[model samples]
Target: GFWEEFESLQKQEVKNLHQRLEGQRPENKGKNRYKNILPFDHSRVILQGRDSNIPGSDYINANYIKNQLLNAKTYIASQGCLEATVNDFWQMAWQENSRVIVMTTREVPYWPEVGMQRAYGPYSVTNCGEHDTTEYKLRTLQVSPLDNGDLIREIWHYQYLSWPDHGVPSEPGGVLSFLDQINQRQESLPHAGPIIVHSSAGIGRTGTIIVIDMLMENISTKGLDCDIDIQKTIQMVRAQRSGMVQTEAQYKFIYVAIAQFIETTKKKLEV
Candidate 1:
């Protein structure tokens, strides 16, 4: 049944979809990690502090993904940072005041090692602290503008390390635990911005993690009786960014993750 629903979603296409012109523009072509995977212009995150003289200077391969069912702009989905676009990535993060960054795939480390600093454009990113856990590595980074270093912001970078190289993790416990800690940190922060998420392509694993978090939030807020439609939720996210939840296995993995989450929640409630 899950496979059948995923197949139907694959065949269905959004009508009159907004064009991704900014990401597809000739001048901005190199900014994207994958040519086909571009953020739609309407919901794309625009860089406010880029060089105004450069055309498409505001472009970045990231989008504001809304939790459609909840009607809230909850996350920013993006691709892994590129050598040339690392400055743009931090710029977007700074502009959005985003505190929590969830990276699903590994990329070249953008922040310096603990107690060191690295400069990217006008920003200096310092690794204030770091700790490695069983499922993820958490880094505390402080970012500030070069001109005004006093205006600094701390960012929490969570890199989920247990995702299998070939397929999804066998159980969702690791990921759920990873997300639980992320949410706790996020909720504790005042005036926190959207949780920025990314994988290599910024679609498959990125989208999957966001959907699970949204679904879990719904269940927590509305109780376990709330409707949980994995297919519809995936479809909603894919509407914002193309090619989310890339495979049938990943599609099925969402169902598995949610089932286990409910079971665990119920067990806790019973006690």
Candidate 2:
């Protein structure tokens, strides 16, 4: 009976999400690596940095996804930077005042080191420390212009190396642990702007991670005792940015992760 309810709901609801939003597709306009991957029109993050002298070169394969009730521009779901769009990606981080980047892939797999080395066309980025965590590797990058000599900003890059592109991690604990670390860092840096989250395509693993964070926050704020409408929570996120929860596998992955979370928390409370 429970299985029937879930299966019935997902067959229509999730299917409709893909079909209804098919008309308003992602911005397939820039030098993005993939033709199919794109940001939805309304929530797309447009870069406004001008002096870079590259027309439309500031566009990154990214979108501004909001939260459930707060409706604040909370996260940027972006594609991994390609060789051409690397400068534009940092231009986005520079202009958007983003101090934290949740990179779900590796630098070697995505793009060249020197591409990110040049920030916003002129600024320089130097790696301060590369520390290995239980689930993720944290790198503190310092970015500033070579000639200006007056401006400098620190960007914390949290690379989640567990999950590959377009797939779920074998376990949820490591991913949750990584999220907790990011949450701790965010608490310390209150002034920092929205966290920029990205995977290779910014749809599969990227979408799954964002949805997990959103649903987890909703559970905490709304009370874990209360029922969370996972379907509606995901729809809300998809409303802001298209193509979230890229596959049935990722959708199922969220449910599994939430189940694990509840079990773990309940055990702790009982003890």
Candidate 3:
């Protein structure tokens, strides 16, 4: 009997959300695809689109890059976007001298580095050098140019194995590590900025990170008494991150984490 009630309420939420939206099919879940998963707090979250460098470059397709960025995509269009075929979209970001994180359900098997290396992080190359073209990054967070060792100093540079890509599950503790890495980053720097995250599409992994930070903040300050409505929280996330969660499965992951947070309510970053 109660199952029917649950289904009805769920459907109603779907309807209410759809009333203000566009592009989603009536059948698919709204938050499942390109639906924007906005951040709860704007201060901490920085969303951007850099070009991808994966040789195969599946996620860096035109539709994923140029089209109206869904909840998971970025707003800015890189200069390379003009002649930017899927092939060039995978050119590695030069300034960071790091690789892009690829997203895919297909695992790399023993080659775990395959996906994470190619698909994660900002899309464009760093503004390390001055060229006459759009190949340079319109937006970069590096302390120095690719020519210098400043790139090495970037905390995101260490975003190798654990980088939240498609192959990796958006594990619970991963977000904390990200926060820690950047926290240490700014601490050491003269003007270290917020923790910025984006992949081929900004939604899935990026949104998940923002949510984790939001939850972590609540627990740290409000403690267990905080009344964080799981659904309400996501609704707010969409407003900020836009399409941050891209699949029903990812949505399910949020619910699972919230349940887990309720159990332990981890307050601080612990070893």
Candidate 4:
């Protein structure tokens, strides 16, 4: 999935895409509404949860959204973007392309209807008929792995033990469990791709997970960079995503996450 060949991305365009990291970063007003609201060129899609509203979904007209879905290469619905919505939009995604990894979180109040839909491959969440694509099964979060293991893409659990809202970039261990699933892919006769995480609001929790993971990945690949600071990381993440990590509790949790590796590293940080 690493970019082998694509038209050269203009420096300005790269700057534009990177700017999204800020626009969605917790209430950024300076964001260029035009560029900010534009759809991301997603090989992956984050459906987001019921908690967070997809900003683009708000301002963009239905016809524009229709156009976005019609052209997308793949879909990776985030945690909690609404199964019913997924069922509807999924029909669109399927018509264009069915390579999807439905993303969802563990915050479902009671019904794991989303998980059920993924496992059985329903026509829709409400409409339990035929699925557009076979070999589905989905990659879900906190959903039963036992039920989802038949190439459900992958299954993940959140173990971000922190002050409040102890999930989504909660703790390193929260994500390590998922390594096994990807490892299963690595051990496969063929190779698998990268990771994807999202919560109710794709901006906050999803961005948090991504930032923390990037730090961890940096630790893994380039050794722990003492400069790694969650506050700064959140700052950067905020600059990109508007609704990301808005509450003190959420920021506190992230600060704690940075502190998580302190004893082992030289990052002079506190939460």
- lDDT tens digits, residues 125-212, model 1? 9999999988899999999998998898999999999898658999888889988888888888868889999998898898889988
**What total of clashing residue pairs does each candidate reach?**
0, 1, 40, 31
- Candidate 2 lDDT (Cα, whole model)? 0.73
Each candidate's lDDT (Cα)?
0.87, 0.73, 0.37, 0.36
Model 3 bad stretches (over 4 Å): 1-142, 145-155, 158-171, 174-178, 183-191, 258-271
Report the lDDT tens digits of candidate 3 across residue range 24-142. 32431222223342222222211224323522222221111211211121222111211233223323233212222222121212111211322222331222321121111111223
Candidate 4 at 133: error in angstroms?
31
Which one is best on lDDT?
A: 1
Question: Which of the two, 3 or 4, has more lDDT?
Answer: 3
lDDT of 4 by residue, 1-271 (tens): 3353333323213334543343354442322233344223322233222224544332110111110211111112233334334443433332333322323344332223443544312332221222221212223332222333343323322222231344334354434334223334333423322333345555555555455444554455455544556655555544433434646655665556645654435644442
TM-score of each candidate? 0.93, 0.81, 0.42, 0.43
Candidate 2: pairs in clash = 26-39
Off by over 4 Å in 1: 1-11, 71-73
How close to the true structure is residue 8 of candidate 2, measured as C-alpha lDDT? 81
Task: Give a tens-digit lDDT track for model 2, residues 1-271.
Answer: 9999999867655333433232233432445666666666567777784635554443567888778555223788988887667767777887778888899876533222522554346666777777887668887887876777578888888898667555678778888888778777766777777889998778778888888887777766677787777787787777765677879988988998888887887898899
Cα lDDT, model 2, residue 237: 78
